[PDB]
UniProtKB/Swiss-Prot annotation:
Tissues expressing this chain: Expressed in unfertilized oocytes (at protein level).
Organism name: Homo sapiens
Protein name (record): Sperm-egg fusion protein Juno
Gene name tied to this protein: IZUMO1R
Residue segments, region Important for interaction with IZUMO1: 43-62
Top-level taxonomy: Eukaryota, Metazoa, Chordata, Craniata, Vertebrata
Family, as annotated: Belongs to the folate receptor family.
Length: 197
């Protein structure tokens, strides 16, 4: 019984109120029961270079499937979760400092360790001269482990602080998962409820 529960942020494609989606593509499935994302949003989240933001995850070419999987999951979470209300902020809305559990950022970091990027902060500095985003002059492509030394850096500096690397572990009751198994239920509802109150 609070205004911050079961709402979608005022962003480009977000549905105005959450509601079930019978069909969401692969990495978006966990949110089928109640989603801020449309079917086409879940499709575009899986395209080689998504039009959701025209941000290429392949700006350094060497992006391994398990790394891209985490990023698609993060897009789904951002676009679909009806449980981000407590973190919705004026940018015309976004989220800021959603607390992601330790394991989410740790697994994300490990699975991207060997992929390549050219920037430690993905907000700004990109060269969009010919459409897509390219690495600027000086920014050499090195492993993720170089530009993102810790899991916290990857979680926080990839989405301009939309995400906060929580010290809390999964099943703490205090932090959200960017992805979860569809069959075991949504672990983020109760956490959102606690932040709303
Ligand atoms: C760039 O992406 C935006 C998505 O915000 C879209 O409106 C636009 O059509 C895209 N333009 C391209 C890829 O030239
Ligand atoms: Cl959620």
């Amino acid at each position: 019984g609070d205004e911050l529960l079961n709402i979608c942020m005022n962003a480009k494609h977000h549905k105005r109120v959450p509601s079930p989606e019978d069909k969401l593509y692969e990495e978006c499935i966990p949110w089928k029961d109640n989603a801020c994302c449309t079917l086409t949003t879940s499709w575009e989240a899986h395209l080689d270079v998504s039009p959701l933001y025209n941000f290429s995850l392949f700006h350094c070419g060497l992006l391994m499937p398990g790394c891209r999987k985490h990023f698609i999951q993060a897009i789904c979470f951002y676009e679909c979760s009806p449980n981000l209300g407590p973190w919705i902020q004026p940018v015309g809305e976004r989220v800021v400092n959603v607390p992601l559990c330790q394991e989410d950022c740790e697994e994300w970091w490990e699975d991207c360790r060997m992929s390549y990027t050219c920037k430690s902060n993905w907000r700004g500095g990109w060269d969009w001269s010919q459409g897509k985003n390219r690495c600027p002059k000086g920014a050499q492509c090195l492993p993720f482990s170089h530009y993102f030394p810790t899991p916290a850096d990857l979680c926080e500096k990839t989405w301009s602080n939309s995400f906060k690397a929580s010290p809390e572990r999964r099943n703490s009751g205090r932090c959200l998962q960017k992805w979860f198994e569809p069959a075991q239920g949504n672990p983020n509802v109760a956490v959102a409820r606690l932040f709303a109150s």
